[PDB]
């Protein structure tokens, strides 16, 4: 499965329910760019 | 100690070491504003 | 060109050069998700 | 007034009204920490 041995994984506590969803959203956003970032050019 | 019974607490996994510190920074930023937000006016 | 009449556009001043690039990065991240968000399912 | 000659100022266009307010919020958050960051210790 390509192994999850990418960068070290971490965690962060976020108080607030609505605010939490907001942080997670930014995280998935960067992960999405990384998907097209490692996309071979051409 | 005013009890930690504020909003429900949550957590988020952030891959990458440098990126992790970045997310945590934004979290502490909002928490700082909340400190002066609950500061009685006058 | 599909017209740029989407949501109203706005602007934000960000002091600091390194910090500025950081904000712009988050903006492009959300815009990327929106691209796959409006992607017809199936 | 201490002169606004701090780091170079910049700008960023953010589509969406609700989203715009969100970005501006993060900006003010970092600026708040900077205020207590330049606060002489002791």
UniProtKB/Swiss-Prot annotation, chains A, B, C, D:
Mutagenesis or variant effect for residue 19 to L: In sporadic cancers; somatic mutation
Positions of region (Oligomerization): 7-38
Outcome recorded upon mutating residue 24 to L: In a sporadic cancer; somatic mutation
Disulfide bonds listed in the record: none
Effect upon mutating residue 13 to H: In sporadic cancers; somatic mutation
Result of altering residue 7 to V: In LFS; germline mutation
Annotated consequence of substituting residue 20 to L: In a sporadic cancer; somatic mutation
Annotated consequence of substituting residue 13 to R: In sporadic cancers; somatic mutation
Reported modifications of this chain: Deacetylation by SIRT2 impairs its ability to induce transcription activation in a AKT-dependent manner. Lactylation by AARS1 prevents ability to undergo liquid-liquid phase separation (LLPS), thereby inhibiting transcription factor activity.
Outcome (variant: residue 35 to T): In a sporadic cancer; somatic mutation
Impact after mutating residue 5 to R: In a sporadic cancer; somatic mutation
Result for mutant: residue 40 to K: In a sporadic cancer; somatic mutation
Phenotype upon changing residue 20 to I: In a sporadic cancer; somatic mutation
Effect recorded for residue 3 to A: Loss of nuclear localization
List of residues that carry Symmetric dimethylarginine: 17, 19
Effect upon mutating residue 29 to T: In sporadic cancers; somatic mutation
Region (Interaction with HIPK2): 1-42
Effect of mutating residue 6 to Y: In a sporadic cancer; somatic mutation
Effect seen on changing residue 25 to G: In sporadic cancers; somatic mutation
Tissue: Ubiquitous. Isoforms are expressed in a wide range of normal tissues but in a tissue-dependent manner. Isoform 2 is expressed in most normal tissues but is not detected in brain, lung, prostate, muscle, fetal brain, spinal cord and fetal liver. Isoform 3 is expressed in most normal tissues but is not detected in lung, spleen, testis, fetal brain, spinal cord and fetal liver. Isoform 7 is expressed in most normal tissues but is not detected in prostate, uterus, skeletal muscle and breast. Isoform 8 is detected only in colon, bone marrow, testis, fetal brain and intestine.
Highest taxon in the source lineage: Eukaryota
Consequence of changing residue 5 to M: In a sporadic cancer; somatic mutation
Disease named in the record: TP53 is found in increased amounts in a wide variety of transformed cells. TP53 is frequently mutated or inactivated in about 60% of cancers. TP53 defects are found in Barrett metaplasia a condition in which the normally stratified squamous epithelium of the lower esophagus is replaced by a metaplastic columnar epithelium. The condition develops as a complication in approximately 10% of patients with chronic gastroesophageal reflux disease and predisposes to the development of esophageal adenocarcinoma.
Record text on subunit structure and interactions: Forms homodimers and homotetramers. Binds DNA as a homotetramer. Interacts with AXIN1. Probably part of a complex consisting of TP53, HIPK2 and AXIN1. Interacts with histone acetyltransferases EP300 and methyltransferases HRMT1L2 and CARM1, and recruits them to promoters. Interacts (via C-terminus) with TAF1; when TAF1 is part of the TFIID complex. Interacts with ING4; this interaction may be indirect. Found in a complex with CABLES1 and TP73. Interacts with HIPK1, HIPK2, and TP53INP1. Interacts with WWOX. May interact with HCV core protein. Interacts with USP7 and SYVN1.
Protein name: Cellular tumor antigen p53
Top-level taxonomy: Eukaryota, Metazoa, Chordata, Craniata, Vertebrata
The encoding gene: TP53
Part of the whole protein covered: 319 to 360 of 393
């Amino acid at each position: 499965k390509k192994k999850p041995l990418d960068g070290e994984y971490f965690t962060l506590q976020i108080r607030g329910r609505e605010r939490f969803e907001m942080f997670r959203e930014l995280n998935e956003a960067l992960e999405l760019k990384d998907a097209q970032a490692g996309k071979e050019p051409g």
